[PDB]
Design a protein around this ligand. Structure first.
Ligand code: IS0
Length: 129
């Protein structure tokens, strides 16, 4: 896309050790699957295109971008070593939204609905085996 958007977060790096865990499998098959199909998922299914949205300050304010398209790639391409890394990515995505946008803006209500579902699912994250 535009040279004015940053490169997306890393999704592939052979130097980073990878592992499948039951908790990572749950994050893909339960957590990502649940949030991805939500009515309000669409603004979070890819990196924020600050050029198209006419938000030239977006990447001035948000220095740790994350989105569910990136997370889906990271889970599908086994990028992670543990569940905490992936949970951290979800939390970063929500916090980016809450930092950039006014409370009660539509995008914030959409993030909050996805976060409520996320919390319910993560409370049920299985014991690591
Ligand atoms: C937070 O800034 C945004 C503005 C517009 C859309 Br669509 C998505 C955004 O973030 C996920």
């Amino acid at each position: 896309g535009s040279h004015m958007n940053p490169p997306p977060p890393e999704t592939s790096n052979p130097n980073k050790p990878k592992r499948q865990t039951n908790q990572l499998q749950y994050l893909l098959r339960v957590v990502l699957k649940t949030l991805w199909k939500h009515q309000f998922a669409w603004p979070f299914q890819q990196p924020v295109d600050a050029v198209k949205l006419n938000l030239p300050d977006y990447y001035k304010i948000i220095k740790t971008p994350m989105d569910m398209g990136t997370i889906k790639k990271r889970l599908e391409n086994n990028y992670y070593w543990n569940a905490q890394e992936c949970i951290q990515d979800f939390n970063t995505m929500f916090t980016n939204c809450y930092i950039y946008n006014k409370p009660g803006d539509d995008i914030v209500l959409m993030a909050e609905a996805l976060e409520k579902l996320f919390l319910q699912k993560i409370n049920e994250l299985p014991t690591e085996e």
